[PDB]
Amino acid sequence: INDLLEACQETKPSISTSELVKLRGIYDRFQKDRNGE
Amino acid sequence: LIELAKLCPFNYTGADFYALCSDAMLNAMSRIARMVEKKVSQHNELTGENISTRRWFDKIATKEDTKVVVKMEDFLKAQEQLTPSVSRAELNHYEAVRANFEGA
């Protein structure tokens, strides 16, 4: 468990929040566009 | 069919209607496939004969089971799941094209 916690602390998101929110917005707009509303 | 015509907005295209009908048929087929699966599973116990769905498809999948029957709810549910394949912005762009190519 401790080694797992060390790995968790070391790990950082492969996606920076900027790209996360950008892609979320793009994908939501595409889903809505497909929904045609 | 008139109800479906009522529900559909004016952005649908022949591709959209084909996709909708395909999804409805797929839902009916999911119903049929599940019912055949229950047939096979239950018969595996009642007769104790674990006759895989293959043997049913070759010998016990009668014409009626092969027969495809669809219900309004299938098309309606697909319609709720349905999503047009073009943006109203693109429709307006093509309308702009039409305006110059049809009004003169």
UniProtKB/Swiss-Prot annotation, chain A:
Q: What induces it?
A: By oleate.
Top-level lineage group: Eukaryota
Report which residue ranges the record marks as coiled coil.
none
Where's it found, cell-wise? Answer: Cytoplasm, Cytosol; Peroxisome membrane
| Domain text | AAA-cassette D1 is required for interaction with PEX6. ATP-binding in AAA-cassette D2 is required for interaction with PEX6. ATP-binding and hydrolysis in AAA-cassette D2 is required for proper function in PEX5 dislocation.
Q: What does the sequence similarity comment in the record state about its family?
A: Belongs to the AAA ATPase family.
Q: What does this protein do?
A: Component of the PEX1-PEX6 AAA ATPase complex, a protein dislocase complex that mediates the ATP-dependent extraction of the PEX5 receptor from peroxisomal membranes, an essential step for PEX5 recycling. Specifically recognizes PEX5 monoubiquitinated at 'Cys-6', and pulls it out of the peroxisome lumen through the PEX2-PEX10-PEX12 retrotranslocation channel. Extraction by the PEX1-PEX6 AAA ATPase complex is accompanied by unfolding of the TPR repeats and release of bound cargo from PEX5.
The miscellaneous remark of the record is: Present with 2100 molecules/cell in log phase SD medium.
Q: How does it assemble?
A: Interacts with PEX6; forming the PEX1-PEX6 AAA ATPase complex, which is composed of a heterohexamer formed by a trimer of PEX1-PEX6 dimers. The PEX1-PEX6 heterooligomers associate with the peroxisomal importomer via interaction of PEX6 with the peroxisomal membrane anchor PEX15.
Q: What is this protein called?
A: Peroxisomal ATPase PEX1
Question: What species was this sequence derived from?
Answer: Saccharomyces cerevisiae (strain ATCC 204508 / S288c)
Q: What is the lineage of its organism?
A: Eukaryota, Fungi, Dikarya, Ascomycota, Saccharomycotina
State the covered range within the intact protein.
Answer: 990 to 1026 of 1043
Swiss-Prot record, chain B:
UniProt miscellaneous comment: Present with 1630 molecules/cell in log phase SD medium.
Give the range the annotation lists for the signal sequence. Answer: none
* Source organism (scientific name): Saccharomyces cerevisiae (strain ATCC 204508 / S288c)
Per UniProt, subunit arrangement is: Interacts with PEX1; forming the PEX1-PEX6 AAA ATPase complex, which is composed of a heterohexamer formed by a trimer of PEX1-PEX6 dimers. Interacts with PEX15; anchors PEX1-PEX6 heterooligomers to the peroxisomal membrane and mediates their association with the peroxisomal importomer. Interacts with UBP15.
Stated role = Component of the PEX1-PEX6 AAA ATPase complex, a protein dislocase complex that mediates the ATP-dependent extraction of the PEX5 receptor from peroxisomal membranes, an essential step for PEX5 recycling. Specifically recognizes PEX5 monoubiquitinated at 'Cys-6', and pulls it out of the peroxisome lumen through the PEX2-PEX10-PEX12 retrotranslocation channel. Extraction by the PEX1-PEX6 AAA ATPase complex is accompanied by unfolding of the TPR repeats and release of bound cargo from PEX5.
Shown portion of the whole protein?
927 to 1030 of 1030
Name the domain of life this protein comes from: Eukaryota
Q: What name has this protein been given in UniProt?
A: Peroxisomal ATPase PEX6
Q: Which gene does this sequence derive from?
A: PEX6
Q: Which family does it belong to?
A: Belongs to the AAA ATPase family.
The domain comment in this protein's record states: AAA-cassette D1 is required for interaction with PEX1. ATP-binding in AAA-cassette D1 is required for attachment to PEX15. ATP-binding and hydrolysis in AAA-cassette D2 is required for release from PEX15 and proper function in PEX5 dislocation.
Where in or outside the cell?
Cytoplasm, Cytosol; Peroxisome membrane
